[PDB]
Tab-separated table of C-alpha atoms (C1' of nucleotides) in Angstrom:
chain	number	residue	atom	x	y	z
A	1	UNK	CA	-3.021	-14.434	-16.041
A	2	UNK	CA	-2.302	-10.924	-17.593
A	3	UNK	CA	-1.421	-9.752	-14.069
A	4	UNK	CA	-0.212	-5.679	-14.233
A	5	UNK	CA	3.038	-6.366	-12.359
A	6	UNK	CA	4.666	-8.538	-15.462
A	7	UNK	CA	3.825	-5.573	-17.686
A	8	UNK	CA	5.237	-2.932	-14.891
A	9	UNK	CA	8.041	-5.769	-14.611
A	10	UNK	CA	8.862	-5.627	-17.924
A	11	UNK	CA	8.284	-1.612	-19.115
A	12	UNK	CA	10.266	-0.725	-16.289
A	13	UNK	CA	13.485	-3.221	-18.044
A	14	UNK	CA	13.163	-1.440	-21.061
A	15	UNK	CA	13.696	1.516	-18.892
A	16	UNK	CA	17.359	0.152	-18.411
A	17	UNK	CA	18.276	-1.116	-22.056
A	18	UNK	CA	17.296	2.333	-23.412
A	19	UNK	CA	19.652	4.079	-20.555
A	20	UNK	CA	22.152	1.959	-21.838
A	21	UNK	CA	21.914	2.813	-25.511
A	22	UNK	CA	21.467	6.343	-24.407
A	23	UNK	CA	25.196	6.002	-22.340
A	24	UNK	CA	26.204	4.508	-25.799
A	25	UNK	CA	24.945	7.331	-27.882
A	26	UNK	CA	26.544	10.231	-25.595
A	27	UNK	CA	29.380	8.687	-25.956
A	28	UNK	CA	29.725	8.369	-29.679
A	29	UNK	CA	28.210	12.088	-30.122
A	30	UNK	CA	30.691	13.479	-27.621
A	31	UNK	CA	33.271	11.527	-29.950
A	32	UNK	CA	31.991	12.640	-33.445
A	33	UNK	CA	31.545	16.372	-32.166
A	34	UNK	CA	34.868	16.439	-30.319
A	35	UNK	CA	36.609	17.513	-33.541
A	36	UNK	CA	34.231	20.505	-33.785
A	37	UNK	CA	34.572	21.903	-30.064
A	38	UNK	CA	36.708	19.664	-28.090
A	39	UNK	CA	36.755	21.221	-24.207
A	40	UNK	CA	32.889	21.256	-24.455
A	41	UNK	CA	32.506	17.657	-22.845
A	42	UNK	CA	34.576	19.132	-19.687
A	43	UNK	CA	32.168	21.819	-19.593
A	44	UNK	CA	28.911	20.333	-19.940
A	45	UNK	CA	29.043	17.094	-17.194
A	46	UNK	CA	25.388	15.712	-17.646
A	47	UNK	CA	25.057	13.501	-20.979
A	48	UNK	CA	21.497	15.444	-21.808
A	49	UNK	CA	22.580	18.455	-21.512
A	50	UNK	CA	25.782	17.899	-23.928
A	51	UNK	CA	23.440	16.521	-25.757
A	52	UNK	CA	21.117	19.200	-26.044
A	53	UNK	CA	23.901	21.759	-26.265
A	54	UNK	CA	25.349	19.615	-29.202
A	55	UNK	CA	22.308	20.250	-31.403
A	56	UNK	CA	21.504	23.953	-30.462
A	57	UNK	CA	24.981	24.949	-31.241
A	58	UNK	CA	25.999	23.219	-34.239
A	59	UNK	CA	28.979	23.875	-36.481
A	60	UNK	CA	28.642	27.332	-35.610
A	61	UNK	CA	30.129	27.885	-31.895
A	62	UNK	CA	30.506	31.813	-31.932
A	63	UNK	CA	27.850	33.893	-30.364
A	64	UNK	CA	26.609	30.846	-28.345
A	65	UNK	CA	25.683	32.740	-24.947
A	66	UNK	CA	22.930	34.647	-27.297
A	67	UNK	CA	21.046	32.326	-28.037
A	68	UNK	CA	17.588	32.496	-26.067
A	69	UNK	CA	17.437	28.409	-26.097
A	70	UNK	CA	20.752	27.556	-24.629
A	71	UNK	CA	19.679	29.792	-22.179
A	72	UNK	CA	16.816	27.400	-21.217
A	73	UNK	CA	19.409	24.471	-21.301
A	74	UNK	CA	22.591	25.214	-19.602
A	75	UNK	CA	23.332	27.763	-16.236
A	76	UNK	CA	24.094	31.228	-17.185
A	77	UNK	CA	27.533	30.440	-15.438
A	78	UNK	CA	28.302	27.894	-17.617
A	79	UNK	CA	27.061	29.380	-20.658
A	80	UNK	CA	29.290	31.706	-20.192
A	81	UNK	CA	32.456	29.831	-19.650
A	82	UNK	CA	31.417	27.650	-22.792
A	83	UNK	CA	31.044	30.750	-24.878
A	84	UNK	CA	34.465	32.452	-23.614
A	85	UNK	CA	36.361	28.651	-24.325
A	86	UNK	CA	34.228	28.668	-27.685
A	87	UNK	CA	36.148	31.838	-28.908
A	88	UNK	CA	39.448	29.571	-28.648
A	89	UNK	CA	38.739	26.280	-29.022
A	90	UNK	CA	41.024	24.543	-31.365
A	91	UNK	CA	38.696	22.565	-33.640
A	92	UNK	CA	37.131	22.485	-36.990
A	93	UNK	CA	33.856	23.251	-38.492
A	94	UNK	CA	32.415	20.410	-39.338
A	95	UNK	CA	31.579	18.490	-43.464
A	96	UNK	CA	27.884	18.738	-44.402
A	97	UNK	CA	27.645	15.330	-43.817
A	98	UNK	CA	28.694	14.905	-40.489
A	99	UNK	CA	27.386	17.519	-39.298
A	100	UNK	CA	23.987	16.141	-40.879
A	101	UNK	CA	24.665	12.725	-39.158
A	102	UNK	CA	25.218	14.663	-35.777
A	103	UNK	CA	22.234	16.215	-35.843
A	104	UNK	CA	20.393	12.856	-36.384
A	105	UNK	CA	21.813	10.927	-33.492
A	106	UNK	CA	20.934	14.122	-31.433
A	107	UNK	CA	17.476	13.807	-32.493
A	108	UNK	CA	17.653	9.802	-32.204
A	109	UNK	CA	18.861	10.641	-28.789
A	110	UNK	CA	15.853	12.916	-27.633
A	111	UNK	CA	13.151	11.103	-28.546
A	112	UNK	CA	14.838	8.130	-26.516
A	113	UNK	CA	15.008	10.106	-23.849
A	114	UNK	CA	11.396	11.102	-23.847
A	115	UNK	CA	10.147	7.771	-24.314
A	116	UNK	CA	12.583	6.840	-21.345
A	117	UNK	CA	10.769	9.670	-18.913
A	118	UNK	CA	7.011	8.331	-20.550
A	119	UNK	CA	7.985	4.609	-19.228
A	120	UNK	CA	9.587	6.002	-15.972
A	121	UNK	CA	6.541	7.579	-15.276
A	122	UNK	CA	4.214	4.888	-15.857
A	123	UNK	CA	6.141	2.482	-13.470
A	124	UNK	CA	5.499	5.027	-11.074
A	125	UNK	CA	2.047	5.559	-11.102
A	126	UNK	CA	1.442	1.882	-11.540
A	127	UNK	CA	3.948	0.532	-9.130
A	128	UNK	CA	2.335	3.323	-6.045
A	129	UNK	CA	-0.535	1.727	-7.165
A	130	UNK	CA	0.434	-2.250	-6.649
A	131	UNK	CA	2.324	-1.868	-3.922
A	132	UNK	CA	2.270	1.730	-2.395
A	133	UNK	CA	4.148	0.500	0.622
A	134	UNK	CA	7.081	-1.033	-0.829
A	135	UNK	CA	7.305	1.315	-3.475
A	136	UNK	CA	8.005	4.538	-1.122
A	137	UNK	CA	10.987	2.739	0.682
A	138	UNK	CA	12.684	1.446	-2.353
A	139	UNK	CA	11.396	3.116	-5.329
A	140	UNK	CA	8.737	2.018	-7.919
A	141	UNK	CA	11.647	0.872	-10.205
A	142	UNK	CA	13.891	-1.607	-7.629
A	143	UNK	CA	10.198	-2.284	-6.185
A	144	UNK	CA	9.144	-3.695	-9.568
A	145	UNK	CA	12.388	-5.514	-9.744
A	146	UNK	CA	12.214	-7.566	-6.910
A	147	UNK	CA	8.412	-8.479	-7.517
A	148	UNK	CA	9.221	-9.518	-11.013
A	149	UNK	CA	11.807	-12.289	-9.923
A	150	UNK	CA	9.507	-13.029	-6.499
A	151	UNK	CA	6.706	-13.726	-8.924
A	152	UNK	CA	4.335	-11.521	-7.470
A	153	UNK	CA	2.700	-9.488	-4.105
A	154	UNK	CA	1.989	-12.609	-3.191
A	155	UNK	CA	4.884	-14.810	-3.425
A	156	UNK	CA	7.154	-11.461	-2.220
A	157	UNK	CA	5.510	-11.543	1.097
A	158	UNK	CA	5.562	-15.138	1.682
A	159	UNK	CA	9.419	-14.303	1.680
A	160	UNK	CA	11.385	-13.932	4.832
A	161	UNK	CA	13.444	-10.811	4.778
A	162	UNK	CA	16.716	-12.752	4.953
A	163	UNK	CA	16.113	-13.919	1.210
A	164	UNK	CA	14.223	-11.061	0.084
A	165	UNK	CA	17.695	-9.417	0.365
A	166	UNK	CA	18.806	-11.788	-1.489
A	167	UNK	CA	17.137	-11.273	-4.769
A	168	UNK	CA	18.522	-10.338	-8.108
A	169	UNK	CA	22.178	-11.495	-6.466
A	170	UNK	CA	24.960	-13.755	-8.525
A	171	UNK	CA	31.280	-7.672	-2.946
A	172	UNK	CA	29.316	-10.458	-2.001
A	173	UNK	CA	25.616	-11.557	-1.102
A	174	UNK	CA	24.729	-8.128	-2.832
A	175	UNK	CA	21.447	-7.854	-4.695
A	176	UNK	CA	18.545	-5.547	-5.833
A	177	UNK	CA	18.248	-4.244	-2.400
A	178	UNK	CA	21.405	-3.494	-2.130
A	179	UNK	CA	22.011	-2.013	-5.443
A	180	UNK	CA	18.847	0.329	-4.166
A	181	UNK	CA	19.219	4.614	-4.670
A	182	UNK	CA	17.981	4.329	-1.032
A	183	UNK	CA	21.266	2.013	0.263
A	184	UNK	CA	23.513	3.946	-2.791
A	185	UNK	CA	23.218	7.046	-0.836
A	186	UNK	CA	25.554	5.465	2.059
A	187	UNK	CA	28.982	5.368	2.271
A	188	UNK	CA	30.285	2.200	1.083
A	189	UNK	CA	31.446	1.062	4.424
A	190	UNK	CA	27.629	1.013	6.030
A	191	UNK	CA	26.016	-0.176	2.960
A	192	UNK	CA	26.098	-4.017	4.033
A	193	UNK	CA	23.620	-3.494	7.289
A	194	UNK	CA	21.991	-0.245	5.727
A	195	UNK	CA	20.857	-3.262	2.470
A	196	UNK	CA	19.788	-5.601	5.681
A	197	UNK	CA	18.007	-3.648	7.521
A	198	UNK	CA	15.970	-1.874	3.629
A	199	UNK	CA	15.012	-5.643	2.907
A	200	UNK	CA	13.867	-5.968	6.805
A	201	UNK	CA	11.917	-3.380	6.670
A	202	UNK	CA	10.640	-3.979	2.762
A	203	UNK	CA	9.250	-7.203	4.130
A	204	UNK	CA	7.051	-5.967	6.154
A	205	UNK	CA	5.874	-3.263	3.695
A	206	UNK	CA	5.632	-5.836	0.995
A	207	UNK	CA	2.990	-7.823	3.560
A	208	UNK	CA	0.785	-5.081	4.560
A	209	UNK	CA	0.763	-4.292	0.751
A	210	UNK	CA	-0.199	-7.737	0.105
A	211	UNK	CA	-3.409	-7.486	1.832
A	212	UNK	CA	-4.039	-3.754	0.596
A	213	UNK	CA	-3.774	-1.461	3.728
A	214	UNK	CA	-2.186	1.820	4.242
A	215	UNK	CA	-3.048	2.400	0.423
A	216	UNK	CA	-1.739	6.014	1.250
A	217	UNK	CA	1.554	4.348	2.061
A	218	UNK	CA	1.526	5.578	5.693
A	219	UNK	CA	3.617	2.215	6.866
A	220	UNK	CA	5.650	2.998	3.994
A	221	UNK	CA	6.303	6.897	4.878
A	222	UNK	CA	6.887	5.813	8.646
A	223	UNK	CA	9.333	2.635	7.700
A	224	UNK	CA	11.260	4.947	6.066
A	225	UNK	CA	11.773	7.620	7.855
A	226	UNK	CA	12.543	4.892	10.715
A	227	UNK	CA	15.443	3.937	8.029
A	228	UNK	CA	16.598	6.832	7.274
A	229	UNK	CA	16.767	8.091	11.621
A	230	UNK	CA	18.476	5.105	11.663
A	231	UNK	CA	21.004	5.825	8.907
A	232	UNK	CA	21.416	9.757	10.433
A	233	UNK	CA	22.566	7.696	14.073
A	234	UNK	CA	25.317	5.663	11.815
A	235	UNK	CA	25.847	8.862	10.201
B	1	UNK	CA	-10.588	-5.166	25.594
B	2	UNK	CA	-11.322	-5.647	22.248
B	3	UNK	CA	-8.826	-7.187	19.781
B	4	UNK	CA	-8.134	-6.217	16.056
B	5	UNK	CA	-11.153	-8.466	14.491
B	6	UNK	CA	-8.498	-9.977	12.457
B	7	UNK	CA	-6.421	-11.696	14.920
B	8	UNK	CA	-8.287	-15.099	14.698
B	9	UNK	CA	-8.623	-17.382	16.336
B	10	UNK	CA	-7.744	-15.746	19.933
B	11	UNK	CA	-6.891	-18.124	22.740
B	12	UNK	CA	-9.087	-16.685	26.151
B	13	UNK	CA	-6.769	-16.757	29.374
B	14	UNK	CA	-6.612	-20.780	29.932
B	15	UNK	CA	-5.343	-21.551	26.792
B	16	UNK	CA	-2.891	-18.276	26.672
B	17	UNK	CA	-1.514	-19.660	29.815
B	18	UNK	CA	-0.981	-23.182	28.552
B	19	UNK	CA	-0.069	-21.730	24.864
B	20	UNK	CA	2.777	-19.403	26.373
B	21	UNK	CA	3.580	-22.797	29.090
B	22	UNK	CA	4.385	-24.829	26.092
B	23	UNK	CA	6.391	-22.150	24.657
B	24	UNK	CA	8.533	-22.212	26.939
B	25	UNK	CA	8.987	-25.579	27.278
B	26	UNK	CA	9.606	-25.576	23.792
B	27	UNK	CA	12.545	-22.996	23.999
B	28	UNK	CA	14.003	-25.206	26.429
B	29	UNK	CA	14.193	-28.460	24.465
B	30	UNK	CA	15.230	-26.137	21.512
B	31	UNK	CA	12.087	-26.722	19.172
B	32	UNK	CA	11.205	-23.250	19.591
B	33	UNK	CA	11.972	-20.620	16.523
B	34	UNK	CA	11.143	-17.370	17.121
B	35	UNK	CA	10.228	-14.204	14.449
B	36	UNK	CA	7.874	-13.963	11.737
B	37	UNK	CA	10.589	-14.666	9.205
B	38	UNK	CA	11.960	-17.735	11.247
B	39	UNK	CA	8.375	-18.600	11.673
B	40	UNK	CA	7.685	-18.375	8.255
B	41	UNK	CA	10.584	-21.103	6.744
B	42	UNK	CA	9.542	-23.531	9.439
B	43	UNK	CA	6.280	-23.632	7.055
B	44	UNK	CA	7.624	-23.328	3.761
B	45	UNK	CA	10.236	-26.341	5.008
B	46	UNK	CA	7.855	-28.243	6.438
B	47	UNK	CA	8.753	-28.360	9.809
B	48	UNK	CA	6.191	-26.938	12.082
B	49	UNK	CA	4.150	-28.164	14.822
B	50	UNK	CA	1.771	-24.986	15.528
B	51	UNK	CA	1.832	-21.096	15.047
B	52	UNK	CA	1.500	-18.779	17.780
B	53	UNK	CA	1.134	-14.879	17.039
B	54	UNK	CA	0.702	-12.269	19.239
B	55	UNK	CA	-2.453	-10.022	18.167
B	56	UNK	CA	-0.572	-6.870	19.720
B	57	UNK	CA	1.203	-6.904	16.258
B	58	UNK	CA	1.721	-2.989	14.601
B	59	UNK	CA	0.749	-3.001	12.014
B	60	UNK	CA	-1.450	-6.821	12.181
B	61	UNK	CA	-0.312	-7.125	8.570
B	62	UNK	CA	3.108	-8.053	8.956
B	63	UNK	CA	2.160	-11.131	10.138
B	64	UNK	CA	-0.822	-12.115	8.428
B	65	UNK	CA	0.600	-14.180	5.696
B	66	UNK	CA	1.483	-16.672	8.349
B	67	UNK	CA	-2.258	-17.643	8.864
B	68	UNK	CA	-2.781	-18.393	4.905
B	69	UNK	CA	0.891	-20.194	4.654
B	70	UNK	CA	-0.532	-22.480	7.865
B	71	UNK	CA	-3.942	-22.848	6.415
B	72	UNK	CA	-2.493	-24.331	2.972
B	73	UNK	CA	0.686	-26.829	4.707
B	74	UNK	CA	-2.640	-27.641	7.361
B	75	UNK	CA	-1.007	-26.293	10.643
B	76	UNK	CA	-2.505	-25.343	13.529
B	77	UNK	CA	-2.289	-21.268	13.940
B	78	UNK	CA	-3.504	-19.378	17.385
B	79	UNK	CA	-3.091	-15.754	18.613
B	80	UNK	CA	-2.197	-14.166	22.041
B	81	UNK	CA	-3.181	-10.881	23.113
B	82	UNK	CA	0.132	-9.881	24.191
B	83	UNK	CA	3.764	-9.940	21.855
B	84	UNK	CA	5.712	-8.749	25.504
B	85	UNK	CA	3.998	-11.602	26.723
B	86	UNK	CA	5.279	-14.129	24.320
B	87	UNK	CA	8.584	-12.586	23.917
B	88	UNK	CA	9.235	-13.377	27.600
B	89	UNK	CA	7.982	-17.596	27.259
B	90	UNK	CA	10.708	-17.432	24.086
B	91	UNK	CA	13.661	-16.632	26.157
B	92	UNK	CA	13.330	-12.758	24.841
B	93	UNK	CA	13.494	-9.498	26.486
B	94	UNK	CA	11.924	-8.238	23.496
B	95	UNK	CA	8.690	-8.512	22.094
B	96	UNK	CA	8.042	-11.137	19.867
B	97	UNK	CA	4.760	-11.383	16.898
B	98	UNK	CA	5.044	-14.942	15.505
B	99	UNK	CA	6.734	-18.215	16.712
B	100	UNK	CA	7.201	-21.531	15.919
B	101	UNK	CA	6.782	-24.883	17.681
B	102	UNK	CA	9.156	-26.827	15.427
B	103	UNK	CA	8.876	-30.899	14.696
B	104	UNK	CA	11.350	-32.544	16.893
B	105	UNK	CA	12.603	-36.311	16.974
B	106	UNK	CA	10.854	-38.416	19.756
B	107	UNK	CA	9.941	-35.120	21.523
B	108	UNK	CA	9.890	-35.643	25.203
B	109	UNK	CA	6.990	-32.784	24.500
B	110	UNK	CA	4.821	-34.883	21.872
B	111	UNK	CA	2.020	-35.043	23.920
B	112	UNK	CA	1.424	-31.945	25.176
B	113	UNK	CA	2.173	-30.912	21.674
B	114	UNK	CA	-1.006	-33.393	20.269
B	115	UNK	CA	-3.278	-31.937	23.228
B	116	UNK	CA	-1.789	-28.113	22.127
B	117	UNK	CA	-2.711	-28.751	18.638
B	118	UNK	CA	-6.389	-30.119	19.391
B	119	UNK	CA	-7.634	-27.184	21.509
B	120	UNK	CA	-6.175	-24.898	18.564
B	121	UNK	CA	-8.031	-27.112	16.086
B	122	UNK	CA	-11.293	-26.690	18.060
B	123	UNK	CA	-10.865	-23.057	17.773
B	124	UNK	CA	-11.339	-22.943	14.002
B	125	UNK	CA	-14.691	-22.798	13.157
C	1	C	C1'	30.748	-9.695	35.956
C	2	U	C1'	27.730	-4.248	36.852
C	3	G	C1'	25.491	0.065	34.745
C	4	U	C1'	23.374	1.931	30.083
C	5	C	C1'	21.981	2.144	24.792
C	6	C	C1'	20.410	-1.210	20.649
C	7	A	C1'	18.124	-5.860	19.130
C	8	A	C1'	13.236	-11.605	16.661
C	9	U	C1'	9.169	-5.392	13.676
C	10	G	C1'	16.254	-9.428	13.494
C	11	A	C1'	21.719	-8.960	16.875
C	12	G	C1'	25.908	-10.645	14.618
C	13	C	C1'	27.763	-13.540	10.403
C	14	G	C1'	28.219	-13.357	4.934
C	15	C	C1'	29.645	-18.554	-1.939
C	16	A	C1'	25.494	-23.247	4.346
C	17	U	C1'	23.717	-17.927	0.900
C	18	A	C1'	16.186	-18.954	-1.744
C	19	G	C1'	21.307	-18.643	3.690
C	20	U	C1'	22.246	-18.357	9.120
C	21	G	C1'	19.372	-16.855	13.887
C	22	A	C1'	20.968	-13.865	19.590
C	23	G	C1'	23.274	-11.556	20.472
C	24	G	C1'	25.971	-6.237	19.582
C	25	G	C1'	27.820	-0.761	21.019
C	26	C	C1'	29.449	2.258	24.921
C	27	A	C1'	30.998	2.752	30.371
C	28	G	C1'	33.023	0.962	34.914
RNA sequence: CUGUCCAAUGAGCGCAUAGUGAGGGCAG
């Protein structure tokens, strides 16, 4: 017992309940701040960066394109249109208190976030590591997924590929394969074959990983770029 | 010419003849599934006769589980040198790196089947 | 039918679905 994967398994699921409380956060700060500078969520697309914005500016929006730190956040393009739509935004400063509240959620927020990137990162490292192959055509993260319900290397392998796409499925006959960045990255319209032909070809990665060859993930590297030729003919 | 070490046990040129004979055959009275993944539910279900798998196989890996899966249910597993070889006795114009002799009710092909499975036995040592 | 490209290292199918298994594209 104490195999790695179940740990990899289950650091990498924490992975998605903190992006979910994270996608719960933005929200509510983007709600609580709207009242201070309301066209800001328009302006600033990615939930960090609002984020990040959010606490470096404050209750004080004026002079915002001077500060040296929002300069390391944001583009100077869009600093710039912030700081112009700043000078007329129709909001309020904000109490004491809620601006104090704000600014803990923000910092709640970060420190999330960090944690997220320190887990990310060790599913990486570990998951190249267990199964360099399958990892490089799928990811370390949907790798580790479809191990953790398999049960293993082992028990992934002795899989055929039809119900390896299978796994992780309850529009239809859709699972973790399918639900893959790799397959994502398609059109909708060839994502049914482009999830067949991913498992395919993450069956036979997950079997020469089972016996610990190509550890440089050479199989891997060539499998996918034997998907992805394959996905430029489809176009 | 040598063969990947690894491809064990490999059947010399009588038994690849009779081997790829009985293949044929096989496809024929329709106990014949053919693929690595095919092969590979025909042992978790039970159902298998014998393994044949070509050691031409790039990379060998992909079907090396089969061996282990056959050596645990206690079915007979052989290689051939050639997966264009066997791909032709299954019917195929393509190549083909694992098959499966499937069990088959009062199979017309039982005995060849029994004498098929004791030269592959005899092999493993 | 014929030519060609693809295809058991999986064609096509898709609540037989922990499944299916040889066929498909294009041109005459």
């Amino acid at each position: 017992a104490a195999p790695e994967y179940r740990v990899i398994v289950d650091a990498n699921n924490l992975t998605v309940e903190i992006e979910n409380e994270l996608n719960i956060i933005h929200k509510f700060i983007r709600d609580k701040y709207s009242k201070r500078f309301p066209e800001l969520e328009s302006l600033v697309p990615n939930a960090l960066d609002y984020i990040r914005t959010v606490k470096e500016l404050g209750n004080s929006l004026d002079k915002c394109k001077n500060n040296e730190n929002l300069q390391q956040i944001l583009t100077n393009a869009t600093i710039m249109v912030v700081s112009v739509t700043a000078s007329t935004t129709q909001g309020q400063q904000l109490s004491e208190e809620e601006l104090e509240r704000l600014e803990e959620a923000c910092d709640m927020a970060l420190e999330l976030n960090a944690s997220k990137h320190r887990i990310y990162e060790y599913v990486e490292s570990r998951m190249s590591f267990i199964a360099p192959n399958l990892s490089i055509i799928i990811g370390a993260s949907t790798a580790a997924k479809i191990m953790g319900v398999a049960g293993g290397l082992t028990n992934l392998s002795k899989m055929p590929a039809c119900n390896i796409m299978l796994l992780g499925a309850q529009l239809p006959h859709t699972g973790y394969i399918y639900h893959s960045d790799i397959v994502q990255s398609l059109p909708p319209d060839l994502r049914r074959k482009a999830a067949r032909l991913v498992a395919a070809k993450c069956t036979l990665a997950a079997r020469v990983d089972s016996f610990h060859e190509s550890t440089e993930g050479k199989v891997g590297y060539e499998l996918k770029d034997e998907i992805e030729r394959k996905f430029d003919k489809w176009q | 010419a040598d063969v990947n070490p690894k491809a064990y046990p490999l059947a010399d040129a009588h038994l690849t003849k009779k081997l790829l004979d009985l293949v044929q055959q096989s496809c024929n009275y329709k106990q014949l599934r053919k693929g690595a993944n095919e092969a590979t539910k025909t042992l978790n279900r039970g159902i298998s006769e014998f393994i044949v798998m070509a050691a031409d196989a790039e990379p060998l890996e992909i079907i090396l589980h089969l061996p282990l899966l056959c050596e645990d249910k206690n079915v007979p597993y052989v290689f051939v040198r050639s997966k264009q070889a066997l791909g032709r006795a299954c019917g195929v114009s393509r190549p083909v790196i694992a098959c499966s002799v499937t069990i088959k009710e009062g199979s017309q092909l039982k005995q060849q089947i029994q004498s098929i499975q004791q030269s592959i036995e005899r092999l493993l040592v």
